[PDB]
Amino acid sequence: MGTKYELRRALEELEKALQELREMLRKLKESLEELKKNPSEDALVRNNELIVEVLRVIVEVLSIIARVLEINA
Amino acid sequence: MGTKYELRRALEELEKALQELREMLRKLKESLEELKKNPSEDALVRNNELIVEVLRVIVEVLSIIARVLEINA
Amino acid sequence: MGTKYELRRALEELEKALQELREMLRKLKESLEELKKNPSEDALVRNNELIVEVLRVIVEVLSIIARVLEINA
Secondary structure (H helix, E strand, C coil): CHHHHHHHHHHHHHHHHHHHHHHHHHHHHHHHHHHHHCCCHHHHHHHHHHHHHHHHHHHHHHHHHHHHHHHHC | CHHHHHHHHHHHHHHHHHHHHHHHHHHHHHHHHHHHHCCCHHHHHHHHHHHHHHHHHHHHHHHHHHHHHHHHC | CHHHHHHHHHHHHHHHHHHHHHHHHHHHHHHHHHHHHCCCHHHHHHHHHHHHHHHHHHHHHHHHHHHHHHHHC
């Protein structure tokens, strides 16, 4: 397998995650606007839930970036 | 135009976005401390709003990072 | 010192921050689930607090990534 493979797999996953993240962002915006219109505790809690969802994937992405940077140098 | 240009433009935008993000972070901290002092539903909603704002820009930054990594390899 | 040192220090800090971020994520998940079980304004405020905590470190990480990319080119 080796290095080029690693790279290619990593960048592949990178773009996949970004599209997930642009998707999740779409939902946040939707939620946020419902929020702004109709504030509510329970609505705050579904919103924070999506936020954490987003954070998880960002961290994943950063983990992948670090690996690419480590491999290339 | 080509490759070096692309790179230079990308890194330029990268740093611009970071300063935006350090700026937005300043506002979050301010908001957060008002929050911690004076909890409130509506204050929670302005806070979550800034959070999403921050997330949008992070995703943008990551999109730019991916592109740089893709170009250099 | 110079370039290789810079790189090595940067990647070192990168991984340190990621482990911090995976740690903070663990706490968010814990908090989030308490939230989902027991919604509350004050619980929302401790949650948003961890969120901002996470954001700070992400921004830091991105600052480090940018620097690596700038150095390597």
